[PDB]
Structure 1
Amino acid sequence: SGIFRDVSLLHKPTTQISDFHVATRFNDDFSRAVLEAEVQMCGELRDYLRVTVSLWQGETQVASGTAPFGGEIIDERGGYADRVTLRLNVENPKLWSAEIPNLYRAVVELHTADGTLIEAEACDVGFREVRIENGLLLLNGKPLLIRGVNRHEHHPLHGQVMDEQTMVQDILLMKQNNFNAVRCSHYPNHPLWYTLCDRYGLYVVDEANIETNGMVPMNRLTDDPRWLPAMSERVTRMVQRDRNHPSVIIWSLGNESGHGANHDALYRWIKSVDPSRPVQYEGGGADTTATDIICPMYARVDEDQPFPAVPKWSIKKWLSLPGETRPLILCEYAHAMGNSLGGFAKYWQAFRQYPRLQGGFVWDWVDQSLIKYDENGNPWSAYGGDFGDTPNDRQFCMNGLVFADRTPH
């Protein structure tokens, strides 16, 4: 517990940019794109206001558009007079991927038409399209193969406080070890993480901070309408904050909360508000109506585990169950606890062999061990119960490919 992320003070003008969303759509071969940026303002709405969105590739301005406020008519009562959408055509855009994280910079200027900049906001833009078609998850029209890992925000000395150095260190090692994707198990991350995955190039699954694993049955709260509002905020505010980051390619509804009607409602909300990214969610059996991707945790390659209600079928058999057509990407596999990863190669052979087997995210990146000091004052790695904590789950907090100080296992 505590104030474990940054605290800051922001000054905004009375007439200001209150939100902005950037989308990139493409022609059939990705040789042409349209960048569309919807901008909303709060404050003093007057005819002289304008929005200029300019797109830069390095120090070169590749495109720009200026428009007064007032969006298209949307219904019988009119349109959003406090919003404007700029559309910029971009030819032969440099596409973003984890392989080549090409980025442009979009600058959003709120200003008077005669030239006074009120304020400007901006973001890195990655031209990429994410879509599932014919059962496959495609990125820029090509099917991905996710070499993913789940990563908690953990530091042996600072607990859950993240810092730039540490994040960088993890992203370098991930890449140096041929990972191309990370799942935010199981909550939105510190904001700099996204900046870094955008820039270094990692595909990201951004996950709502919703986990009710300990309930009995697990969907007791998620199927309860009285918990819809609390859950809604966790999903909606995440999307509102992270929707312009190219690194985020998939949204997840949370983790181990069973399958409740709240999930269905929220799945739909995202699909309406942000059609650019698939939505996934493993609870309730990993292939529920609340997921665009079959995203089991620990389903084996050839061996079925037919538990009642939420069986974990062999991943190869799961893809072809009668009527199933979705791609399958394990949200968690290859539990790296202690001396483990036995059978890892079996997964990779299947993934390469079956098109719709598109990978998975290893559980997990770093052991959650904490440093304790002995009588002599020498540091030692502690786990569950080492702080008097009880009940506790002992060494179950250490499941990483790397030790808490980033030394590899």
Structure 2
Amino acid sequence: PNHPLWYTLCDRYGLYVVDEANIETHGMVPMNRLTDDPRWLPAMSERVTRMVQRDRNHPSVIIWSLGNESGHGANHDALYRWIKSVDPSRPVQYEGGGADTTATDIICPMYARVDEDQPFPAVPKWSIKKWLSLPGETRPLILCEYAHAMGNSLGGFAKYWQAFRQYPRLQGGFVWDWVDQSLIKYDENGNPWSAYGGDFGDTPNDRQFCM
């Protein structure tokens, strides 16, 4: 959840917001180790319930998110239903566990390609055109993350938009991302330069992946 002024600004200027619970357990093995654990349900529930209680009156918020990159656990299913029960006015989405689990109203993959399948075990990233029409599938597809804009990038961005316009149930996505997370450091003469992972003696680090 963002600084509270963010939502006031989105209400007034006019932007659709996905409000997202502060829950990410990416580094766990497997990714759902905590979120399938009933011991961690209370701690996870507070991150979801307190966001909803805080932000539920903002018109800019149109979709709730259960968090990010935390696999799919039974804790997600419980909190999905909690939101559906207390706030029926907004769909709930969540990408974890393969982007089309029972904890999401929207097929919301990250970095699924337009035409090319990436059939990873358990959590495949189907081509978005294919994904919509898998047997039994009816939901809208909106990429929670796509077109990773790292450095000289956004190659093939037009391919996404051609498909978005041609397919009714492809209703877009959210580019990753808005702003380089570079930090400012200063040389001997006081000249500022842009720093990234590792430039603060921080180790282990992931170098330029923050930009």
Deviation at 1:344, TM superposition (A): 0.1
- Alpha-carbon distance in structure 1 between the residues aligned to 2:26 and 2:68: 8
Give a deviation string over 1:75-121, Cα, whole Å, max 9, x none: xxxxxxxxxxxxxxxxxxxxxxxxxxxxxxxxxxxxxxxxxxxxxxx
**1:292 maps to which of 84, 87, 105:** 105
SS state of the match for residue 257, structure 1?
coil
Give a deviation string over 1:344-368, Cα, whole Å, max 9, x none: 0000000000000000000000000
Deviation at 1:245, TM superposition (A): 0.2
Deviation at 1:331, TM superposition (A): 0.1
Superposition RMSD in Å? 0.2
**1:238 maps to which of 32, 36, 51:** 51
- Alpha-carbon distance in structure 2 between the residues aligned to 1:375 and 1:305: 48
Deviation at 1:309, TM superposition (A): 0.1
- Alpha-carbon distance in structure 2 between the residues aligned to 1:222 and 1:192: 30
SS state of the match for residue 107, structure 2?
coil
Deviation at 1:283, TM superposition (A): 0.1
Give a deviation string over 1:181-219, Cα, whole Å, max 9, x none: xxxxxxx00000000000000000000000000000000
- Alpha-carbon distance in structure 2 between the residues aligned to 1:367 and 1:296: 22
* Stretches of structure 2 lacking an aligned partner (at least 5 in a row): none
**Identity, % of aligned positions:** 100
Partner of 1:150: none
The structure whose residues are more often helix, as a share, is 2
* Stretches of structure 1 lacking an aligned partner (at least 5 in a row): 1-187, 399-409
Give a deviation string over 1:349-407, Cα, whole Å, max 9, x none: 00000000000000000000000000111000000000000000000000xxxxxxxxx
In the comparison of the two structures, how many residue pairs are matched?
211
Partner of 2:86: 273
Give a deviation string over 1:130-161, Cα, whole Å, max 9, x none: xxxxxxxxxxxxxxxxxxxxxxxxxxxxxxxx
SS state of the match for residue 143, structure 2?
strand
SS state of the match for residue 302, structure 1?
coil
Deviation at 1:324, TM superposition (A): 0.1
Deviation at 1:261, TM superposition (A): 0.1
The structure whose residues are more often strand, as a share, is 1
SS state of the match for residue 90, structure 2?
coil
Partner of 1:392: 205
- Alpha-carbon distance in structure 2 between the residues aligned to 1:241 and 1:298: 30
Deviation at 1:269, TM superposition (A): 0.1
- Alpha-carbon distance in structure 1 between the residues aligned to 2:187 and 2:105: 50
Deviation at 1:281, TM superposition (A): 0.1
**2:118 maps to which of 277, 280, 305:** 305
TM-score (norm 1): 0.52
Give a deviation string over 1:222-274, Cα, whole Å, max 9, x none: 00000000000000000000000000000000000000000000000000000
- Alpha-carbon distance in structure 2 between the residues aligned to 1:277 and 1:331: 16
**1:382 maps to which of 195, 204, 207:** 195
Partner of 1:212: 25
Deviation at 1:337, TM superposition (A): 0.1
Q: Which runs of 4+ in 1 moved over 4 A?
A: none
